[PDB]
């Protein structure tokens, strides 16, 4: 029933002191056996802290925690690259088998310089078109920070129907990627002079175009 509320986002630079709060009620946090968990990209959670303050085996001692009243705090003393991750508190409530996890915090490590998106726009394959289908694929890479918006156009007018766009995801090189798909019939594809994928990144737009007559 209870809610453990955390900040949605925290950030800092390498080596900075960063804290994450976990506010509950006297029936959960206030009872003083708070635990903390880290979830790194594409890994199962790992336990960081238990019993408000104890550190799990193998966890670096830049991580510490404490509690005052109905608020528990996790502190990282010197922010490290590997600390970019999601963090969750938890507590029992009224029963040791009724666990409440907190709402979760995403921690980002700042440092990366700004980088614009590379954009590649692929037209539908002949093979797909044979099936009376046309998918245009806009692939977006190597941008930072991880925030782009995508607008599709046919002959300079905006199309919204049958578009699916991903959110940004972290690449192995610590920049971001995203993709967008526009699903058309083969007839709609052929009927237009040109289609465009227009990607905006913090106010600056990179546009790619394909013309059915050339593709």
């Amino acid at each position: 029933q209870g809610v453990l509320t955390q900040p949605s986002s925290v950030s800092g630079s390498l080596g900075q002191r960063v804290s994450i709060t976990c506010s509950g009620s006297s029936s959960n946090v206030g009872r003083g056996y708070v635990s903390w968990y880290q979830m790194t990209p594409g890994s199962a959670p790992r336990t960081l802290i238990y019993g408000d303050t104890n550190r799990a085996s193998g966890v670096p001692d830049r991580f510490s925690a404490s509690r005052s009243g109905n608020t528990a705090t996790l502190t990282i003393s010197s922010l490290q690259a590997e600390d970019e991750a999601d963090y969750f508190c938890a507590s029992a409530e009224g029963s040791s088998s009724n666990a409440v996890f907190g709402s979760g915090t995403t921690l980002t490590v700042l440092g990366q310089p700004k980088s614009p998106p590379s954009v590649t726009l692929f037209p539908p394959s002949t093979e797909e078109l044979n099936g009376n289908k046309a998918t245009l694929v806009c692939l977006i890479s190597d941008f930072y920070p991880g925030s782009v918006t995508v607008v599709w156009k046919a002959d300079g007018s905006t199309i919204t129907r049958n578009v699916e766009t991903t959110r940004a995801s972290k690449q192995s090189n610590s920049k971001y990627a995203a993709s967008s798909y526009l699903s058309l019939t083969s007839s709609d594809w052929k009927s237009k002079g040109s289609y465009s994928c227009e990607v905006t990144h913090e106010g600056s737009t990179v546009t790619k175009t394909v013309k059915p007559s050339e593709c």
Partner: protein
Amino acid sequence: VQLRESGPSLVQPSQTLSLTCTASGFSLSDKAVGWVRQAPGKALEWLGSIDTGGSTGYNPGLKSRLSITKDNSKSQVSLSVSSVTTEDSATYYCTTVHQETIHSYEFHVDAWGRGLLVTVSSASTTAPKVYPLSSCCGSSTVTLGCLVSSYMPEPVTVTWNSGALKSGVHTFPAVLQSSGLYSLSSMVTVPGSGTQTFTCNVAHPASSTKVDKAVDPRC
């Protein structure tokens, strides 16, 4: 101790999802096992636990749909979730938990399984259609790719030239399209390459399919 979840990666709305946990290096009569899930873009969510004596506790919001049992014999713990909706799509984790009882209650996760993604969808297992991509018609560098179209469930794996080609390969996370099926794309940028050859190798384990699609670099 490692914990391992087993069960379907895909189930239909209104059906019952049933998972098993094993992979144990200790006795269920010595420790409590919990289930935890995480729906995409949500927080970890407690489902419930079963202690050494077989006593269960459940998330009160979900309890009417949840059943956890065990059999000490096979060192296995079960979870069933009834009347599933898309809200039940999640990565499901088996765990070992500390549960103990001024009158405060102690809880933490000791050990975590690797987790099993389960998707609840009207769509059933569907192998992808693979289409060759070329940016040509949009330059000393051409970008090639493969569209991995209309599959269910995740995941899909893509290599190029059987793993020989890695440099300049970028495979993107999938989109879920209005069809109810997933699509993802893999691209490679080739500095050339007149009679060099480009093949994408797609694997969709759930349908037991591998597809090789040759892709024409000419431009």
